[PDB]
């Protein structure tokens, strides 16, 4: 461990490095990470790699705040320091967090969801149907992508002729306006409900957790998906043959590609974790990517199986701060892998996956497939 | 007033409104300007337009906080609410202002400003050498621009091979902690190595930024509306370049006509009155330096460009506690510019009208064509 730099986003170019995290796991659960030249604020941080100690972290978000501790001045969810925190939903503690929670979910109707479902199957249909079968394309960009920007768009009523606006930046402006607009005339959507309960900046910045939860999260989860069975093609042909099995093929879908592999917290208080003493004001990151293949918890952790449960993984969180969308990201999974597995038994990867330079999002960024 | 939005970029879009703040100062110094479907956040503010309530305000940091007030959350110096409000140097109240403006201005050294200089004054030389008289050419990218973005590249430490980063941002938030890393492992004698070794990244990106806009939005406003104005009033820019002696006059002339930064956000932090109206404890207050600087209360023959213009009070480079800590630096590069040019040009032509940046917060030219003979 001495010698391995979490920061070092070399270490993620090529997917979240398992290898480095079994080491982490194996050596020191809880230990503490000194800076390099490549971590956020020239400050270290405790870094936590198991399954035991990831969950004591999440379920005390009192003594792991979302915001900040000690005497730091803002910390947030992100290893950097962020002023953000506070401010959105995801970097709030009690009681506001409470309260903004309770009004974002309301947003969350059924006829929401109803519309978003509609929407979904209507264009993965259309999306799969002109699959060209056996000629290469790039799963990514051309369906991976599009539908979870879609349901952000939905969720954010963001009317179809301005969709473009949202899909060009993967904004300012427009989303400035599509909030006063909402303001002037309420309408049946979320950022409706959240902009006439806030500042355009907390607006904006709900804005964009979507669109990233969207854009980025879920995305992620679909094209690492399809690449989890192109690799398991034995567990494909059993997927498609009995679709009674997706709902637990997704769960491991979402443990196996954690595509949000780590989260950030500050102590507010002296505590020991995992036999450290971890001082009020000092950064905690948890590592759900790694307490996902925990072997203390997970049977064959390190091997794919869509009929695996249980199935406790922390691919969602877990606690107060589970994620909202959760779901709406298992909606998106199973109606493209019905649309998908329904016709197509066979998904050939024809050049490696590139996958994104990041600790925070584990992601491919191209995939390019032959479906057949 | 009640058919005017002062938060409708349209009404910006070619240059500072100065006939709406005339009807401003004359029907309403201070008052509450209510929401339109373009203000910041939907909520209204009071809205200041004279100088001697403007001049007030800014005298005022405890009574109109640059951070907040009242149950507001997050205020800052913009209309809409920030939340870096507290955490830049310009959006900061005492005690931390203090301490941190200290902090800043000990890195504004005689070698510093001297190292600025020496670069300012073989850059101006350069780019002047390279005029084709009589040729039309952008003066904003070639030249108001260049110059002040060298300028913050001394300040805050850039090295000559990395200044692509800004000049192209005009991928650098990457640039920027990386730069902000290596000052921390090796001190360097530089504004940002100051700030640095004395903060988070966040923070320190803030000021990055705060200087970095300092250089490539205010200076580069202030050097293309000042050939501007002097291309409009052909014999003073002919009396100016006859005797240099009149070129400190003129810059504070400079300034005063093209307020570069007209407008300012405050919150009220407690109950006050201004201009005869009562504020309440958290409510927005921006002031119009733009404004302010053509009082015809204050300033004889107000809406007249006058290079002799003495005394000259003016508010471009605000007032009180917040004063630009760049006022010198500004007018170094405003002196040395036009030093050069109007050595080697009497004749300057603007032969495409000026193109403004659309802003309520900043009074910018994009683009401005220009034969010089
Ligand atoms: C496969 C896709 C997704 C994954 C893996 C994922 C993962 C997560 C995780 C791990 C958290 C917990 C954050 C923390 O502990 O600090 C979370 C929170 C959250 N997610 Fe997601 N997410 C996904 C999709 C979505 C979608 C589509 C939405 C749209 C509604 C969404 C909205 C939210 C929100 C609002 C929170 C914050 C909840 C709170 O803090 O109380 N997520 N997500
Ligand atoms: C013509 C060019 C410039 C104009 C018109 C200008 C204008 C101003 C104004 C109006 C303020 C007051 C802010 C407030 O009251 O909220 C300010 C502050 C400030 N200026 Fe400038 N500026 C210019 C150039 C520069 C330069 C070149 C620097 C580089 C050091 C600079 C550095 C700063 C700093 C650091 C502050 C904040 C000081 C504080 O909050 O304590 N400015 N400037
Ligand atoms: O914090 C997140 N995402 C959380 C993890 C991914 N996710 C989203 C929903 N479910 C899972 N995103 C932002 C995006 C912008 C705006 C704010 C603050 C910074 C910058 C980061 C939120
Ligand atoms: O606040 C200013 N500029 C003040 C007026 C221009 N100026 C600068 C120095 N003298 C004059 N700039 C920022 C730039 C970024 C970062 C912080 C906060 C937001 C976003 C705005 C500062």
Redesign the interface.
Known sequence: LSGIDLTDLDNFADGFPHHLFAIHRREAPVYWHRPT??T???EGFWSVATYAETLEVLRDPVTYSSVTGGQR??GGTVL?????A??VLNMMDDPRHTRIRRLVSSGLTPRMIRRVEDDLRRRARGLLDGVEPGAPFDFVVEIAAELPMQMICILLGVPETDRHWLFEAVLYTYA??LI??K??EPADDMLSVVANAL???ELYLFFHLLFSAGAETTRNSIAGGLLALAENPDQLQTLRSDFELLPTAIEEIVRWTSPSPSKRRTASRAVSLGGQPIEAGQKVVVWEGSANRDPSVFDRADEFDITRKPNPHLGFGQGVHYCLGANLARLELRVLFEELLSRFGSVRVVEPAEWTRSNRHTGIRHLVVELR
């Open positions: 030249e490549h956020p604020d020239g001045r803002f950097q320091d962020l002023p953000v506070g401010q400035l306006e006063a607009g303001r002037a500042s355009d900046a």
